[PDB]
């Protein structure tokens, strides 16, 4: 089973933190990557487990991970996913569906 990544739509105000949860369980090792997928120019691997403003933390149940943007900016808006990489016989990536982050302007 692929990771799930939630919430599917997270809206926060610029300056706030933004946290997605990637849930993935796999009996026998993995790397768990957090990718930005859009906008097309901005696609990038953000952060990883195990390894600035993007943090990935494994929760104590071992199956949930928090992927957090610290102090979200307007141009953090876009879509994101989590992908798990396995090497055990024998190597593949399983990605979640995307989730969207909307970062709302602080209009004075």
From Swiss-Prot:
Q: Which parts of the sequence are annotated with region: Interaction with CD274/PDCD1L1?
A: 37-44
Where does the record place the Ig-like V-type domain? 3-104
For region Pembrolizumab binding, the annotated ranges are 41-58
In the UniProt record, which residues carry a glycan? 17, 26, 41, 75
Q: How is it modified after translation?
A: Ubiquitinated via 'Lys-48'-linked polyubiquitin chains. Deubiquitinated and thus stabilized by USP5. N-glycosylation at Asn-26 contains at least two N-acetylglucosamine units and one fucose. N-glycosylation does not affect binding to nivolumab drug.
Outcome of altering residue 41 to A? Decreased N-glycosylation without affecting binding to binding to nivolumab drug
Please indicate which superkingdom the organism of origin belongs to: Eukaryota
Compartments in which it is found? Cell membrane
All ranges on the Extracellular side of the membrane: 1-108
Taken from the UniProt record, the cysteine pairs bridged by disulfide bonds within this chain are: 22-82
> Impact of altering residue 17 to A?
Decreased N-glycosylation without affecting binding to binding to nivolumab drug
The subunit field of the Swiss-Prot or TrEMBL record says: Monomer. Interacts with CD274/PDCD1L1. Interacts with CD273/PDCD1LG2. Interacts with FBXO38; leading to ubiquitination and degradation of PDCD1 by the proteasome.
Q: What does this protein do?
A: Inhibitory receptor on antigen activated T-cells that plays a critical role in induction and maintenance of immune tolerance to self. Delivers inhibitory signals upon binding to ligands CD274/PDCD1L1 and CD273/PDCD1LG2. Following T-cell receptor (TCR) engagement, PDCD1 associates with CD3-TCR in the immunological synapse and directly inhibits T-cell activation.
Q: Give the disease association.
A: Autoimmune disease with susceptibility to Mycobacterium tuberculosis: An autosomal recessive immunologic disorder characterized by lymphoproliferative autoimmunity and onset of various autoimmune diseases in early childhood. Death from autoimmune pneumonitis may occur.
What protein is this chain from?
Programmed cell death protein 1
Per the UniProt entry, what species is this protein from, by scientific name?
Answer: Homo sapiens (Human)
Q: What is the lineage of its organism?
A: Eukaryota, Metazoa, Chordata, Craniata, Vertebrata
